[PDB]
Design an enzyme around this catalytic site. Structure first.
Site, PDB file in Angstrom:
ATOM      1  CE1 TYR A  93      -3.544  -2.779   0.726  1.00 35.08           C
ATOM      2  CE2 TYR A  93      -1.780  -3.586   2.204  1.00 35.08           C
ATOM      3  CZ  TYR A  93      -2.993  -3.787   1.520  1.00 35.08           C
ATOM      4  OH  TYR A  93      -3.652  -5.000   1.567  1.00 35.08           O
ATOM      5  CD  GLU A 117      17.158   3.689  -8.804  1.00 37.17           C
ATOM      6  OE1 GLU A 117      18.125   4.323  -8.280  1.00 37.17           O
ATOM      7  OE2 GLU A 117      17.346   2.736  -9.601  1.00 37.17           O
ATOM      8  CG  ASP A 162      19.224   4.885 -13.470  1.00 34.30           C
ATOM      9  OD1 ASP A 162      19.575   6.040 -13.178  1.00 34.30           O
ATOM     10  OD2 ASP A 162      19.428   3.970 -12.699  1.00 34.30           O
ATOM     11  CB  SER A 192      15.006  -6.166  -9.665  1.00 30.14           C
ATOM     12  OG  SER A 192      14.809  -5.091  -8.785  1.00 30.14           O
ATOM     13  N   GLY A 193      16.849  -3.905  -9.621  1.00 29.67           N
ATOM     14  CA  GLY A 193      17.863  -2.867  -9.450  1.00 29.67           C
ATOM     15  C   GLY A 193      17.530  -1.594 -10.226  1.00 29.67           C
ATOM     16  NE  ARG A 227      17.746  -0.992 -17.243  1.00 30.45           N
ATOM     17  CZ  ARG A 227      18.476  -1.141 -16.121  1.00 30.45           C
ATOM     18  NH1 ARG A 227      18.627  -2.335 -15.520  1.00 30.45           N
ATOM     19  NH2 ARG A 227      19.049  -0.057 -15.588  1.00 30.45           N
ATOM     20  CB  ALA A 228      17.819   1.400 -24.657  1.00 28.25           C
ATOM     21  CG  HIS A 260      26.300   4.570  -6.124  1.00 36.02           C
ATOM     22  ND1 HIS A 260      25.676   3.496  -5.499  1.00 36.02           N
ATOM     23  CD2 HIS A 260      25.487   4.948  -7.143  1.00 36.02           C
ATOM     24  CE1 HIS A 260      24.517   3.275  -6.082  1.00 36.02           C
ATOM     25  NE2 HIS A 260      24.401   4.103  -7.105  1.00 36.02           N
ATOM     26  CG  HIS A 291       6.723 -11.870 -15.241  1.00 32.02           C
ATOM     27  ND1 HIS A 291       7.099 -12.895 -16.091  1.00 32.02           N
ATOM     28  CD2 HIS A 291       6.249 -10.871 -16.050  1.00 32.02           C
ATOM     29  CE1 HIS A 291       6.821 -12.551 -17.351  1.00 32.02           C
ATOM     30  NE2 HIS A 291       6.330 -11.313 -17.360  1.00 32.02           N
ATOM     31  CE  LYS A 320      16.024  -4.998  -5.677  1.00 26.18           C
ATOM     32  NZ  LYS A 320      16.046  -4.039  -4.552  1.00 26.18           N
TER      33      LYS A 320
HETATM   34  O1  LIG Z   1      17.665  -0.868  -4.399  1.00 25.43           O
HETATM   35  C1  LIG Z   1      17.977  -1.274  -5.641  1.00 25.43           C
HETATM   36  O2  LIG Z   1      17.337  -2.245  -6.114  1.00 25.43           O
HETATM   37  C2  LIG Z   1      19.049  -0.603  -6.521  1.00 25.43           C
HETATM   38  C3  LIG Z   1      19.336   0.874  -6.189  1.00 25.43           C
HETATM   39  C4  LIG Z   1      20.551   1.374  -7.034  1.00 25.43           C
HETATM   40  C5  LIG Z   1      20.194   1.238  -8.521  1.00 25.43           C
HETATM   41  P1  LIG Z   1      21.143   2.352  -9.532  1.00 25.43           P
HETATM   42  O3  LIG Z   1      22.708   2.440  -8.729  1.00 25.43           O
HETATM   43  O4  LIG Z   1      20.441   3.733  -9.541  1.00 25.43           O
HETATM   44  O5  LIG Z   1      21.441   1.862 -11.148  1.00 25.43           O
HETATM   45  C6  LIG Z   1      21.719   0.495  -6.639  1.00 25.43           C
HETATM   46  O6  LIG Z   1      22.105  -0.472  -7.296  1.00 25.43           O
HETATM   47  O7  LIG Z   1      22.369   0.716  -5.493  1.00 25.43           O
HETATM   48 CA   LIG Z   2       4.317   0.974   0.239  1.00 27.57          CA
HETATM   49 CL   LIG Z   3      17.817   2.311 -17.599  1.00 26.43          CL
HETATM   50 ZN   LIG Z   4      20.214   5.141 -10.948  1.00 24.27          ZN
HETATM   51 ZN   LIG Z   5      22.616   4.479  -8.308  1.00 27.02          ZN
END
Ligand SMILES: O=C(O)CC[C@H](CP(=O)(O)O)C(=O)O
Ligand SMILES: [Ca+2]
Ligand SMILES: [Cl-]
Ligand SMILES: [Zn+2]
Ligand SMILES: [Zn+2]
Ligand SMILES: *[C@@H]1O[C@H](CO)[C@@H](O[C@@H]2O[C@H](CO)[C@@H](O[C@@H]3O[C@H](CO)[C@@H](O)[C@H](O[C@H]4O[C@H](CO)[C@@H](O)[C@H](O)[C@@H]4O)[C@@H]3O)[C@H](O)[C@H]2NC(C)=O)[C@H](O)[C@H]1NC(C)=O
Ligand SMILES: *[C@@H]1O[C@H](CO)[C@@H](O[C@@H]2O[C@H](CO)[C@@H](O[C@@H]3O[C@H](CO)[C@@H](O)[C@H](O[C@H]4O[C@H](CO)[C@@H](O)[C@H](O)[C@@H]4O)[C@@H]3O)[C@H](O)[C@H]2NC(C)=O)[C@H](O)[C@H]1NC(C)=O
Ligand SMILES: *[C@@H]1O[C@H](CO)[C@@H](O[C@@H]2O[C@H](CO)[C@@H](O)[C@H](O)[C@H]2NC(C)=O)[C@H](O)[C@H]1NC(C)=O
Ligand SMILES: *[C@@H]1O[C@H](CO)[C@@H](O[C@@H]2O[C@H](CO)[C@@H](O)[C@H](O)[C@H]2NC(C)=O)[C@H](O)[C@H]1NC(C)=O
Ligand SMILES: *[C@@H]1O[C@H](CO)[C@@H](O[C@@H]2O[C@H](CO)[C@@H](O)[C@H](O)[C@H]2NC(C)=O)[C@H](O)[C@H]1NC(C)=O
Ligand SMILES: *[C@@H]1O[C@H](CO)[C@@H](O[C@@H]2O[C@H](CO)[C@@H](O)[C@H](O)[C@H]2NC(C)=O)[C@H](O)[C@H]1NC(C)=O
Ligand SMILES: *[C@@H]1O[C@H](CO)[C@@H](O[C@@H]2O[C@H](CO)[C@@H](O)[C@H](O)[C@H]2NC(C)=O)[C@H](O)[C@H]1NC(C)=O
Ligand SMILES: *[C@@H]1O[C@H](CO)[C@@H](O[C@@H]2O[C@H](CO)[C@@H](O)[C@H](O)[C@H]2NC(C)=O)[C@H](O)[C@H]1NC(C)=O
Ligand SMILES: *[C@@H]1O[C@H](CO)[C@@H](O)[C@H](O)[C@H]1NC(C)=O
Ligand SMILES: *[C@@H]1O[C@H](CO)[C@@H](O)[C@H](O)[C@H]1NC(C)=O
Ligand SMILES: *[C@@H]1O[C@H](CO)[C@@H](O)[C@H](O)[C@H]1NC(C)=O
Ligand SMILES: *[C@@H]1O[C@H](CO)[C@@H](O)[C@H](O)[C@H]1NC(C)=O
Ligand SMILES: *[C@@H]1O[C@H](CO)[C@@H](O)[C@H](O)[C@H]1NC(C)=O
Ligand SMILES: *[C@@H]1O[C@H](CO)[C@@H](O)[C@H](O)[C@H]1NC(C)=O
Ligand SMILES: O=C(O)CC[C@H](CP(=O)(O)O)C(=O)O
Ligand SMILES: [Ca+2]
Ligand SMILES: [Cl-]
Ligand SMILES: [Zn+2]
Ligand SMILES: [Zn+2]
Lengths: 687, 687
Positions: free
Chosen positions: B216, B366, B395, B459-460, B476-477, B490, B626, B636
């Site tokens: 939720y 995110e 992204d 994911s990620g 995504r591309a 980072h 899925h 992940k």
């Molecule tokens: O929490 C996640 O699933 C990923 C967040 C971030 C994704 P990104 O670095 O923005 O491509 C990361 O990998 O630390």
């Molecule tokens: Ca929530």
């Molecule tokens: Cl992307």
């Molecule tokens: Zn990112």
């Molecule tokens: Zn990031």
């Protein structure tokens, strides 16, 4: 048009079909039920449907042992069996010939031979067991419980009993509930003989369908749980009996007085609560040898393809399997569907098609826990959830002959009001008046003003999976008397003759129900704008929010301590009201000539029921996903509103961690407010 | 038309937007991120979008303590802190001025001050811990683990570590993974200085979104779990460090040799596995004081209303929050979306509208676990699931400059092949050639033949909730190099200058990605028939069925003993192939002039991704629903196929009840076969 459809339905055809469906028993899983399925399929085909298929599933059923029958005994200090219950009901006149009529049994009982002292529990409701473990201090642990049928689904009774410690349950029909004064026993009236017994399943499935395959269709390669992880199976033996056998078991009962007159039925016994007899010294012994077994079932699925919106489905469904002859339950509904189909098929032969696809189901194994409809819907869930407009159920057309009984989603209230004003009342003394008028005079709305009563949907019938699990708008309509069942319910005595002689000799009530049922399906499948009125949901949401609020307010100190607010729910409801009101305006103001805009609006009407589904389900009830409605946890047959909050609040005074408990109330208020708000947003402009 | 759209995108505009987005840090939950949200909203409005709103949520974030900083010490026998890790990264040239740059930390670490012996675990993968607890017999219990970044999401590492008994985890970047040979450290090249540290969250959310409100939206009245029932929080302290601080911690390490060369990185240390130092006698001590706190986040949601199918949504989404300046991650993607929007807005001002509604998101938080996108999708789930055509993520546009990297559903493969043949390659030595050709030459398909590689979605990133939970077709591309992240990932060093100087001086790779991204969204939102090809799913389903079959067949004796058959899955796949093939024929053969039939077919294309969702979710992963795809449970970032079966089979040799385990394999084969069959049936004639 509609009148052409309604005029083609004949009372005499229904009569002929009901007679055909009731000559032999059609128990789920038997060859006879299979042959009736094959026959329905051929006929729906000759009637004109574009296709008609059988869909089968292999599901857990339950059957008495042919050579080791079930009964209950009074035994004595030595083990002499003094009294023995019936092995079968005395077959009615002219059917002493019956091939095999299944003897009375409680479907899904485990096997067993327990004995012990008797405790009488009235209807075995939650409040009955409260009065008994709380007020009276009687203790059901290790006792055999004996309870009368009535008030609540017999599955809840067994569960209540099981949970109160019982080692067995005996159910019986008491004449107070099953003998209407001044009417005679069958074959000379419609009352239940002292030798009649109500059959029926005693599962707690909570919408799961087949016990062994919850979530997925019991198809050819289904993986099944072992029976020990099966859903809904009772763990104590249960058996039903008539009121002759009942008097024998009740007359020697000791312990405390019945706590009051509401606990006492009509037999000439004290209705002492027990435990034990006056007689010390003798016990009750049950003999249960029924077995559970995976057995093949068959649904008949007919399709009438829609001319314009073929990918939109209006479903008319009801079950075909019976406990014995199914004179009322289900064939009086099944014969109505047969005639509805024949009638649509007639229009089709003259070259008409409805606007939307209409689907017709003859469901199997309903008596055993709505298994055929459920398995079919699990198999076809993706089609149903994107294409499903509405589901109209078609079980028993009559359970009396006083008036109409309608349960449906609020979305169909206006449809049902309009249809019934266009229908002739078949009621003595309302000739030339409309069904609306007799129905309103005879069963007036409690809400008001000059409106009929329409009740909530719970469960106990085949609409369950469509409404409660999938969020497809659903209704049902039948003729009724003035939750217990008519007296001859699930008995060998429920026969064609019971209906022709005593219920509906003209078949005029059948015809009326056929008109209300087929009338809804026709409007649903043909009206250019879906006949739903979202403002009707706005109104009941406010009543239910008031109701659940009032229940919480019986506890003002806890509401203060824990900051329990209903502000979010009322706010959601107020927004749903405003947004529904604006949506109605747009629905009035757009050109039906633009198809894409028509489709968009119909899709909003269609997905609105769907918006009330939570994919996580209700707490502990993963197959009940509707947030506004669920079956009562105390009575499957009854609809409950804001079930999540209702159950978090129920008997809350007894939880031992009041703040855990009130926390969960708050969580449920949040889920409800959010869901109502999200549902409303489906009716907003889409971009 | 499309070319008008593509021609209006300018590399110089992207440059200008990226520079604007990178001058100060935009950490989730800070005022600076809020102001950038307000600014995006005003500009998307001036660009022409019909509406632009902020949607906010109150979610659990994590932040270092301003006045009690985190670090790691070597202490001695008495408690003297001999060595101390950095308190911050040396700020890059000209930004020594930075207001506040958050120091390196692992978001969502609990607080703590543990000390103990060090054990080196390589990348802290499942196989690393296998080699260590199984082969080597080293025992991580009560140890502090130290692992290098790379290979797998750092959340999995922490979970692996946590589960192997560790009391703390220290992560660091090793030059083997984060220093490409012959390139210099920032500010003189794009490599990671020995003082650079990778920030990043270390949650295991498994798609839940905000930890406190799974299911939720974290709205105003949300009910929240107490932090002890929060989803995904690590239970041991974790902190990241550069390779200077790393050498200091690694150089005194005792115990066993590294089991082989794949365990040894680039620093001049032995890479002994420990536990403990050579030095006995001193310990490692961690000091963690980060706090978790509910904090407000803001998504910007722009709407371009569709002219014909306004109730159909094509979504372009990517996040706005950064760990520091977000020079690559995310603003190189965000600046691309800004320019896509500006360009669509231009066409709209000249009076064009796309056929379907296009939605544009600037997601927040995110970096902290895809929280903004997830909360928004939970709030709007009913709209998304009935109206959602496709989701295109946005992204980082570049993580290198060698070639295109595309991950998407099979439904979009053909779309992506066709779009890239219509696009100019921006690659040195492919001038006058198409992107398809350079992409195929540079990243050839493993499958074959003369096709590019396209990978699975795990994911990620922000597409997760749309694909994995809701079943909305997603792609995504980006431009890439030759799962670890580029070296300055980072870090304080990921700045506008890093991109302008070393990655994409012409902004020509950005422009290409803008063309692939905006190109997809344009086709999705404007093609009269949805550009999906269901036959492409048929083909990969067969490859995945082969794959999962081969894995099971490493265990022939158990497959015999337990009757493990894949016959149902292959049969399902074969049927999906035949039915998809027939569906393509109908899609070729109908008149696009009939709108209702067009809509029906588009709705089948649209709901086909949706057909792969199981509402019960995957085992233990209720938010991954899925059945064909899920994120790897070991990583992940990586997509896994037939995840339910894959995980029931993984390390199955070690389960202690082989028949329970093989039973669950069988159950998962059944779920998969059934789902593939049901998906296929969505493509059958509808009546
Ligand atoms: O929490 C996640 O699933 C990923 C967040 C971030 C994704 P990104 O670095 O923005 O491509 C990361 O990998 O630390
Ligand atoms: Ca929530
Ligand atoms: Cl992307
Ligand atoms: Zn990112
Ligand atoms: Zn990031
Ligand atoms: C029914 O619909 C109405 C919309 O007509 C909707 O009302 C919305 O309510 C929320 C509050 O419940 C409002 O959000 C607030 O307004 C702004 C954000 O735009 C903020 O300044 C407010 O935050 C401050 O105050 C908060 C608590 O009072 C603090 O916790 C917070 O940190 C801030 O300091 C607050 O978020 C919103 O403006 C209206 N929308 C309107 C009137 O347009 C209502 O919620 C709907 N009902 C349901 C149950 O969804
Ligand atoms: C892919 O599509 C094909 C449809 O083209 C589909 O094939 C179907 O398979 C089932 C068996 O898997 C068939 O059902 C059988 O046929 C009849 C019912 O009409 C029965 O006689 C059979 O039952 C007997 O035999 C059973 C086991 O062998 C016994 O257990 C049973 O008690 C009976 O004695 C059996 O039910 C069906 O005919 C076909 N449909 C066809 C060919 O039209 C296939 O299943 C699809 N794949 C998936 C995974 O859905
Ligand atoms: C109910 O009616 C059906 C069909 O009208 C009867 O079955 C048909 O009539 C005879 C019976 O052998 C055959 O020529 C047909 O093949 C049957 N048709 C079917 C099964 O579609 C059926 O026997 C009737 N049932 C009863 C008990 O009256
Ligand atoms: C109730 O039924 C039982 C079971 O059929 C009767 O007791 C049986 O009687 C026969 C012959 O008298 C014996 O061989 C069996 O040992 C008995 N079976 C059991 C299990 O007790 C009993 O007589 C019946 N009671 C009445 C009152 O009719
Ligand atoms: C039930 O009937 C009423 C009365 O005909 C219908 O409401 C009218 O519908 C027309 C058509 O849109 C409107 O222009 C009128 O203003 C409505 N009258 C009232 C009192 O609302 C209603 O639509 C019908 N309900 C259905 C068909 O579901
Ligand atoms: C990024 O560009 C924006 C908008 O072009 C700059 O903000 C605008 O320009 C000045 C700044 O005070 C004001 O007159 C406007 O009100 C601002 N518009 C907005 C916020 O929409 C912004 O300062 C730039 N950021 C940087 C760091 O260059
Ligand atoms: C690493 O950091 C610690 C903490 O700031 C240093 O130890 C502190 O030193 C001051 C003054 O010498 C004392 O008042 C504190 O008792 C110490 N704090 C703690 C918790 O130990 C330590 O010197 C630093 N080590 C190095 C090598 O620089
Ligand atoms: C990708 O392009 C191919 C080649 O144009 C498209 O396939 C053709 O589509 C037309 C339009 O229906 C057909 O009549 C041709 O027979 C197709 N050629 C082939 C080789 O299939 C395909 O539709 C495009 N994919 C998209 C747009 O998603
Ligand atoms: C029914 O009981 C008979 C007769 O005593 C016995 O032989 C048989 O096992 C039973 N059949 C089943 C399992 O229902
Ligand atoms: C009922 O009796 C049994 C002992 O036979 C006991 O263990 C059980 O807890 C009792 N229930 C109550 C309410 O005292
Ligand atoms: C049918 O109609 C009459 C008219 O009052 C009613 O009294 C009679 O009892 C009805 N039959 C049943 C079964 O209720
Ligand atoms: C951070 O640590 C300071 C300084 O020692 C302390 O006073 C404060 O409680 C902390 N703030 C929080 C809770 O993050
Ligand atoms: C690792 O060490 C501890 C004792 O400090 C022990 O309890 C734990 O079970 C050990 N693990 C293995 C694999 O022996
Ligand atoms: C950008 O392009 C050149 C051309 O080969 C490449 O070698 C250079 O290292 C690239 N930049 C990055 C960051 O990879
Ligand atoms: O299993 C149920 O939910 C109900 C089955 C049956 C419904 P019906 O008697 O057919 O109206 C019954 O109540 O025993
Ligand atoms: Ca099932
Ligand atoms: Cl009904
Ligand atoms: Zn029944
Ligand atoms: Zn029934």
């Amino acid at each position: 048009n509609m009148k052409a459809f309604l005029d083609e339905l004949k009372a005499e055809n229904i009569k002929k079909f009901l007679y055909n469906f009731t000559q032999i028993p059609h128990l789920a899983g038997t060859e006879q039920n299979f042959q009736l399925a094959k026959q329905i399929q051929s006929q729906w085909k000759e009637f004109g449907l574009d296709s008609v298929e059988l869909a089968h599933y292999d599901v857990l059923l339950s059957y008495p042992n042919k050579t080791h029958p079930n009964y209950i005994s009074i035994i004595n200090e030595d083990g002499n069996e003094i009294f023995n219950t019936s092995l079968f009901e005395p077959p009615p006149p002219g059917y002493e010939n019956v091939s095999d009529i299944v003897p009375p049994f409680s479907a899904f009982s485990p096997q067993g031979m327990p004995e012990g002292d008797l405790v009488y529990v009235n209807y075995a409701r939650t409040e009955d067991f409260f009065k008994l473990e709380r007020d009276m201090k009687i203790n059901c642990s290790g006792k055999i419980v004996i309870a009368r049928y009535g008030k609540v689904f017999r599955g809840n009774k067994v569960k209540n009993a099981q949970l109160a410690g019982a080692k067995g349950v005996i159910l019986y029909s008491d004449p107070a509930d099953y003998f209407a004064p001044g009417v005679k026993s069958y074959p000379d009236g419609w009352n239940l003989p002292g030798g009649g017994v109500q059959r029926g399943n005693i599962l707690n499935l909570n919408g799961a369908g087949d016990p062994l395959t919850p979530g997925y269709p019991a198809n050819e390669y289904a993986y099944r749980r072992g029976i020990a992880e099966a859903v809904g199976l009772p763990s104590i033996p249960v058996h039903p009996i008539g009121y002759y056998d009942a008097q024998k078991l009740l007359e020697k009962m000791g312990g405390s007085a019945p706590p009051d007159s509401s606990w006492r039925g009509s037999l000439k016994v004290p209705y002492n609560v027990g435990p034990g007899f006056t007689f010390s010294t003798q016990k009750v012994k049950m003999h249960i040898h029924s077995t559970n077994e995976v057995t093949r079932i068959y649904n008949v699925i007919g399709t009438l393809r829609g001319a314009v919106e073929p990918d939109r489905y209006v479903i008319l469904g009801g079950h075909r399997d019976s406990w014995v002859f199914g004179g009322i339950d289900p064939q009086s509904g099944a014969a109505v569907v047969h005639e509805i189909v024949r009638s649509f098929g007639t229009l089709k032969k003259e070259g008409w098609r409805p606007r939307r696809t209409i689907l017709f189901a003859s469901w199997d194994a309903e008596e055993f826990g709505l298994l055929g409809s459920t398995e079919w819907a699990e198999e076809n869930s993706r089609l149903l959830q994107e294409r499903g407009v509405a589901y109209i159920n078609a079980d028993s057309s009559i359970e009396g002959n006083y008036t109409l009984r309608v349960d449906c989603t609020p979305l169909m209230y206006s449809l049902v009001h309009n249809l019934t004003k266009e229908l002739k009342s078949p009621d003595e003394g309302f000739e030339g008046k409309s069904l609306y008028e007799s129905w309103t005079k005879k069963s007036p709305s409690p809400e008001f003003s000059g409106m009929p009563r329409i009740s909530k949907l719970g469960s106990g019938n085949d609409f369950e999976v469509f409404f409660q699990r999938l969020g497809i708008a659903s209704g049902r309509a039948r003729y009724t008397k003035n939750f217990s069942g008519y007296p001859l319910y699930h008995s060998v005595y429920e026969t064609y003759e019971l209906v022709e002689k005593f219920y509906d000799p003209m078949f005029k009530y059948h015809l009326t129900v056929a008109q209300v049922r087929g009338g809804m399906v026709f409007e649903l499948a043909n009206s250019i704008v879906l006949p739903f009125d979202c403002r009707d949901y706005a109104v009941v949401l406010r009543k239910y929010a008031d109701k659940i609020y009032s229940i919480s307010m019986k506890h003002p100190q806890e509401m203060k301590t824990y900051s329990v607010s209903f502000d979010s729910l009322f706010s959601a409801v107020k927004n749903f009201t405003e947004i529904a009101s604006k949506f109605s305006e747009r629905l009035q103001d757009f050109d039906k000539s633009n198809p894409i805009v028509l489709r968009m609006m119909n899709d909003q009407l269609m997905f609105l029921e769907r918006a009330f589904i939570d994919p996580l389900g209700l707490p502990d009830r993963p197959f009940y996903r509707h947030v506004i409605y669920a079956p009562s946890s105390h009575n499957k047959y009854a609809g409950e509103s804001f079930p999540g909050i209702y159950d978090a609040l129920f008997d809350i005074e007894s939880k031992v961690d009041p703040s855990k408990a009130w926390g969960e109330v708050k969580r449920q208020i949040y889920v409800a407010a959010f869901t109502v708000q999200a549902a409303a947003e489906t009716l907003s402009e889409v971009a």
